[PDB]
Amino acid sequence: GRVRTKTVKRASKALIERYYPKLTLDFQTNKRLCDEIATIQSKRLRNKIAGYTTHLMKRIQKGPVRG
Amino acid sequence: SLVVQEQGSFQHILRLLNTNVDGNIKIVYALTTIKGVGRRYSNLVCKKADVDLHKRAGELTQEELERIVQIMQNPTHYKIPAWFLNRQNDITDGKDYHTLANNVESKLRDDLERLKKIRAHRGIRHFWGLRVRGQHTKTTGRRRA
Amino acid sequence: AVPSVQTFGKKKSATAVAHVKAGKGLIKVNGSPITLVEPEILRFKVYEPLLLVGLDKFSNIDIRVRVTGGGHVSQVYAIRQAIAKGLVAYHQKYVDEQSKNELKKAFTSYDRTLLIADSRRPEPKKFGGKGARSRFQKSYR
Amino acid sequence: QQQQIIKIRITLTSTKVKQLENVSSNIVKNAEQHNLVKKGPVRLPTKVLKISTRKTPNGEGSKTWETYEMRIHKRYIDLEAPVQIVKRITQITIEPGVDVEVVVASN
Amino acid sequence: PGVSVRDVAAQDFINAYASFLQRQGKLEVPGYVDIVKTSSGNEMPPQDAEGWFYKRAASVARHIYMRKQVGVGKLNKLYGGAKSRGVRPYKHIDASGSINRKVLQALEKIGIVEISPKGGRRISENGQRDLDRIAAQTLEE
Amino acid sequence: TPVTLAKVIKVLGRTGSRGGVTQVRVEFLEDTSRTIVRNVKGPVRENDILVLMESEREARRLR
Amino acid sequence: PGTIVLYAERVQDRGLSAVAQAESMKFKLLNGLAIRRAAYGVVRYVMESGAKGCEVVVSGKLRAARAKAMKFADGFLIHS
Amino acid sequence: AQHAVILDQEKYDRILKEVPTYRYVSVSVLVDRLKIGGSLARIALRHLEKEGIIKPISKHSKQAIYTRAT
Amino acid sequence: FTPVVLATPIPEEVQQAQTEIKLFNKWSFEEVEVKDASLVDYVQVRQPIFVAHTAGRYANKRFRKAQCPIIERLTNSLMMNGRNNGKKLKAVRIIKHTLDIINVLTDQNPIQVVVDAITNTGPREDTTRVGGGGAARRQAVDVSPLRRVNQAIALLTIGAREAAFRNIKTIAETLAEELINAAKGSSTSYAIKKKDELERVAKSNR
RNA sequence: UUAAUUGCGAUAACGAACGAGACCUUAACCUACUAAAUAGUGGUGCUAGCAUUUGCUGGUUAUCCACUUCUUAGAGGGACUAUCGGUUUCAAGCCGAUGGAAGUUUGAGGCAAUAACAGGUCUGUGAUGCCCUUAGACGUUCUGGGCCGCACGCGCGCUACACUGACGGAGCCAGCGAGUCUAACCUUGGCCGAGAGGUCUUGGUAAUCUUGUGAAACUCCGUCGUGCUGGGGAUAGAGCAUUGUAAUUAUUGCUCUUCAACGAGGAAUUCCUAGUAAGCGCAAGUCAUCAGCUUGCGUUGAUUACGUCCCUGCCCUUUGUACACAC
RNA sequence: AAAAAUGAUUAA
Ligand SMILES: [Mg+2]
Ligand SMILES: [Mg+2]
Ligand SMILES: [Mg+2]
Ligand SMILES: [Mg+2]
Ligand SMILES: [Mg+2]
Ligand SMILES: [Mg+2]
Ligand SMILES: [Mg+2]
């Protein structure tokens, strides 16, 4: 399965809180921005965080999201 | 690819060295029925007997069968290197022999009797019927040994 | 210099490096002609890139293939993959690429492994069994 | 001796990747700093030393095996330099756990 | 028109060269032929009692021609094979060293191979010549 | 032998103790309104044709 | 002689050395101080030294023939 | 069962008589229809192809496939 | 037509294969047209293969093996009973020989003979074990097309293997005669009679 | 809903921790970087060997230039279920297709919580309490023997019952390793010998040499011909060698001879879902000698199913209990 | 709605 754990979920939510204007709908630049708007010890976790951040962004675009 | 046509001159079951050597089988694998001669010994005897290797043991003629028997009796006098033989450097006289059909069992009896009469371990193991080459007897060779 | 490209094809552990330059239609494997590739039951596996695209455009080109590693079948598959990748590589470098696109479509419509190495890899053995999955016979009582 | 080249060769072996790479980088840096033309650090395939043992000290339980590994990383650099500088480089650029060998190549 | 022994099939080329060597009389059989079984792994002597040595000589000459130099030990490993060991599993056993040595010496006396200052036996001048001739006639048979 | 052919339009579920049987909802090709539920042995996708010796039973082991 | 040379230098932040803590507790046990006291004193010293977590396990026979294992912990402790 | 490994005159005229009209000619069919051993079948098959009254389709060891000529 | 000169001499008999894909360069997949409906999209004779040996991944999905060519599926089914595990080269050579023999005995496309045998040997009704009591019973169920082709291939290869065991006749020849008999339906072929027994038992447990 | 106490969420709980995940190793992708007689390719530039209006090869960085596609290893990039189409308390997610080297957590492992078991080890330990013993010793050495002993029962296995084969010739391909100067380790090559092996030398403290470990299955061409047969090679006899002070109770290897059961195995029962099962060999461990064992490695490579709780069990919830040594 | 009996003493 591909359920994303609380670390990815919370890190993505914090990124949405802090840098919503800077962030963009696509994974490539979201991943690049994560390199400096956050410090992640592993490229795998950074990619997961950016993927969930862009998923949340694509959901926020078509209506708001709770929490 | 020679399709040779033969008359009623095929030799069926025949006698070499007091044994029944049947036709319809190549001479090399037909001589193997004689005790003391196997596939290697028969093939060497045949090629030294200068006989073709596709003769089915039946279109062998009398003089070449006799030559095969003589070579079997006397391997050394037809350039057989004496490491190819059944009995090299025997206890009795130290000359390289080769035991044939009726004499393999006789000589086996004689050497087992020699071991028994000298009361050696392998001989008494043969007398008891156990294994003589150091095999474990705990689990194998149960039903008949 | 002579216009040339060098490519490779990879099966499980066999690798075949192919030199593809301008020539007269010379296809060799290990210095021997492609017609003598063994086993001959699978010799057509090597023939396939020839017989699909067509020998017409192999006239100007020649390919020299050196293959090591693996087994006989794996080497055969390495050779065919290396030949196809060399052909697409030379057409990319020194020829217009619409022809490269017909080559790509012809190879991929037949078999995916003409251009792409099979991604299957050996699974290491684990203790308590003769193989990666199989275990030793268990006994009770 | 009279300011002539010796055809020297240096070999680096260690179990520590970072320390060994630091040593190699330092030697390279002193190389082109003193303007040396050279064959760069050639990296030999990593040697993995394996011992497989039964985990249990006795012979009871599920037969579980366990493999320990050492990793041996080796590099060599072929240099050509006078005595006054081969000694200068050799007496510096050394770290613990990194064994250095210096040989005079005559081939 | 130009060709070496790489553009002909191995098996029929070896048959052609063995038949050639047989017809000609320069190559010498050792004499312990008709007795030996050419490998400890084997259990029966060669079924071609009159031509097996010539076949081995042709095979050795072709193998030497393919390579830089090859020695008796490598020939033994090449021609050796799995040995049935009764109720025990098979294992690789080397071929007859004396046979490989005698066939190499016979090829030397006929002149096909020579000293090879790397340490083995390599292909010689007239050996390369007539081996290429045999390849040529095998193609234009 | 009046063997009939049916086309599966809906897969219902998996039945049998070991789960080795599948329940399918199949219409007929001649009449596309003669739907019956059948029990099938092997793997089944959608839009597959079955050949039935008998063409009147209703498969059991529902729900 | 002279190719072996042997220096001794002081351990900084000695409360973060598990070997030193285990030795000190061992000698406290040999001197006879209470096992719970010695374990908790070791844990407090380690935590005061700035460790993220400490863990002391004392296994064996304690006051009874039957052996048991006492466990003392403070802070956080990862395992995998 | 037994098969004759020697070819006598009668078995040769019979094989030359009825091998033609065989849809499939091979070692197995020769042994099954005529009481000839496998080796005798192989050499007889080679003689028949040599004289050209049966034509081969595939020449492979352990599997010889032949049919009627012309 | 119109052979092209090449630096490497490539024979004419394989020049002719450049026209269209031919299995073993002798038989074509054109004009096959599996006739028994309910088996199309499952007996793959659409994409033509030059030889029955490819290293294709047909086991990582559920129904993916339906796209594997049916000749290769039969060839894979030849490698069985331990001593023949692997040895796909031997299996392919056996298939080539048995197709040669099939075309010898019938002036007819061997691929058509194979697909006809598979269609005639696919079991349409089987039974499944049910009932928890001491005497378990059999409940009649229908068979999917994929299982039909799988069981047909298995029955054909098993019958060929058993008829080949301990007799002079070659595995290629007995596979040929088994496929010939199953392509028509004669109740003398192993797969046909086994399917008949399965269907009769399904009738009994109807 | 997830493989997951993984999350969506609900909510007398709030906010945390361990475990899971994350992490680390390894396996795949990189014509991107950095370069390499301890890896290779080309130019054959250099002579060149063999056939010929150009091919295959030899010696190729102290004969020489280049250049890293393949090989190696550092720094890195790459996948995050991306996009699309469906479905969902439309949330967590899930299912298809398209791209991609890679879409079951991409594969496989390493690590791995709390509590416990009178689970195993006092025969690994100069870890150890207590008890016993300590000079005719239960201490320690030396000789010899046993541990292997066979009416029998059982568990891991090996080799087979053959023609999808045995035998013979020829073809001819891996990957993981290991290796001596504090002493004889891996051994090339030449010579001798049927063989096993012997001898004279060489190289290698090793990407350099053994070694391209030219492994085996396999492939092609022939002998066999459904006969316990040329399948099988147990048992046994004779001789020749190697390791070792020492080979008898046969260390092992080799040659000839003997040529038994076994024709597919009752009840019953094991393992396994893709480079996997199975076949096949190889290296390492133990080792003076001894693999039918193990740990890994590669070669060839299926069938079947993507499910269920019927059997055997595991997890959570509810419920009953006269159980707590816990059915 | 097939059949399914038993498990010595002490030992927290
Ligand atoms: Mg070999
Ligand atoms: Mg003693
Ligand atoms: Mg014991
Ligand atoms: Mg290698
Ligand atoms: Mg021993
Ligand atoms: Mg060993
Ligand atoms: Mg052991």
UniProtKB/Swiss-Prot annotation, chain A:
It is found in: Cytoplasm. It comes from the Eukaryota. Present with 30900 molecules/cell in log phase SD medium. There are 2 genes for eS17 in yeast. Belongs to the eukaryotic ribosomal protein eS17 family. Component of the small ribosomal subunit (SSU). Mature yeast ribosomes consist of a small (40S) and a large (60S) subunit. The 40S small subunit contains 1 molecule of ribosomal RNA (18S rRNA) and 33 different proteins (encoded by 57 genes). The large 60S subunit contains 3 rRNA molecules (25S, 5.8S and 5S rRNA) and 46 different proteins (encoded by 81 genes). Component of the ribosome, a large ribonucleoprotein complex responsible for the synthesis of proteins in the cell. The small ribosomal subunit (SSU) binds messenger RNAs (mRNAs) and translates the encoded message by selecting cognate aminoacyl-transfer RNA (tRNA) molecules. The large subunit (LSU) contains the ribosomal catalytic site termed the peptidyl transferase center (PTC), which catalyzes the formation of peptide bonds, thereby polymerizing the amino acids delivered by tRNAs into a polypeptide chain. This is Small ribosomal subunit protein eS17A. The chain holds residues 2 to 68 of 136 of the full protein.
Curated annotation (Swiss-Prot), chain B:
Component of the small ribosomal subunit (SSU). Mature yeast ribosomes consist of a small (40S) and a large (60S) subunit. The 40S small subunit contains 1 molecule of ribosomal RNA (18S rRNA) and 33 different proteins (encoded by 57 genes). The large 60S subunit contains 3 rRNA molecules (25S, 5.8S and 5S rRNA) and 46 different proteins (encoded by 81 genes). It comes from Saccharomyces cerevisiae (strain ATCC 204508 / S288c) (Baker's yeast). One of its GO terms (cellular component) is cytoplasm. The lineage of its organism: Eukaryota, Fungi, Dikarya, Ascomycota, Saccharomycotina. Present with 48100 molecules/cell in log phase SD medium. PROSITE patterns: RIBOSOMAL_S13_1, RIBOSOMAL_S13_2. This is Small ribosomal subunit protein uS13A. The modification N6-methyllysine is found at residue 47. It is found in: Cytoplasm. N-terminally acetylated by acetyltransferase NatA. Coiled coil: none annotated. Keywords: Acetylation, Cytoplasm, Isopeptide bond, Methylation, Ribonucleoprotein, Ribosomal protein, RNA-binding, rRNA-binding, Ubl conjugation. Belongs to the universal ribosomal protein uS13 family. GO terms for biological process: cytoplasmic translation; endonucleolytic cleavage in ITS1 to separate SSU-rRNA from 5.8S rRNA and LSU-rRNA from tricistronic rRNA transcript (SSU-rRNA, 5.8S rRNA, LSU-rRNA); ribosomal subunit export from nucleus. Its main location: cytoplasm. There is a cross-link at residues 35, 48, 79, 95 (Glycyl lysine isopeptide (Lys-Gly) (interchain with G-Cter in ubiquitin)).
UniProtKB/Swiss-Prot annotation, chain C:
InterPro entries: Ribosomal_Su5_D2-typ_SF, Ribosomal_uS9, Ribosomal_uS9_CS, Ribsml_uS5_D2-typ_fold_subgr. Residues 132-141 have a biased composition (Basic residues). One of its GO terms (molecular function) is RNA binding. The modification Phosphoserine is found at residues 32, 59, 74. The keyword Cytoplasm applies. Residues 121-141 are annotated as: Disordered. It holds the Pfam family Ribosomal_S9. One of its GO terms (biological process) is translational initiation. Keywords: Acetylation, Cytoplasm, Isopeptide bond, Phosphoprotein, Ribonucleoprotein, Ribosomal protein, Ubl conjugation. It is found in: Cytoplasm. GO terms for cellular component: 90S preribosome; cytosol; cytosolic small ribosomal subunit. Component of the ribosome, a large ribonucleoprotein complex responsible for the synthesis of proteins in the cell. The small ribosomal subunit (SSU) binds messenger RNAs (mRNAs) and translates the encoded message by selecting cognate aminoacyl-transfer RNA (tRNA) molecules. The large subunit (LSU) contains the ribosomal catalytic site termed the peptidyl transferase center (PTC), which catalyzes the formation of peptide bonds, thereby polymerizing the amino acids delivered by tRNAs into a polypeptide chain. Present with 33800 molecules/cell in log phase SD medium. Belongs to the universal ribosomal protein uS9 family. This is Small ribosomal subunit protein uS9A.
Curated annotation (Swiss-Prot), chain E:
Keywords: Cytoplasm, Ribonucleoprotein, Ribosomal protein, Ribosome biogenesis. Present with 29000 molecules/cell in log phase SD medium. There are 2 genes for eS19 in yeast. It is found in: Cytoplasm. The gene is RPS19A. InterPro entries: Ribosomal_eS19 (IPR001266), Ribosomal_eS19_CS (IPR018277), WH-like_DNA-bd_sf (IPR036388), WH_DNA-bd_sf (IPR036390). One of its GO terms (cellular component) is cytosolic small ribosomal subunit. The keyword Zinc does not apply. Component of the small ribosomal subunit (SSU). Mature yeast ribosomes consist of a small (40S) and a large (60S) subunit. The 40S small subunit contains 1 molecule of ribosomal RNA (18S rRNA) and 33 different proteins (encoded by 57 genes). The large 60S subunit contains 3 rRNA molecules (25S, 5.8S and 5S rRNA) and 46 different proteins (encoded by 81 genes). PROSITE patterns: RIBOSOMAL_S19E. It comes from the Eukaryota. This is Small ribosomal subunit protein eS19A. Coiled coil: none annotated. It comes from Saccharomyces cerevisiae (strain ATCC 204508 / S288c) (Baker's yeast). GO terms for molecular function: RNA binding; structural constituent of ribosome. It holds the Pfam family Ribosomal_S19e. Belongs to the eukaryotic ribosomal protein eS19 family. GO terms for biological process: ribosomal small subunit assembly; ribosomal small subunit biogenesis; ribosomal subunit export from nucleus; translation.
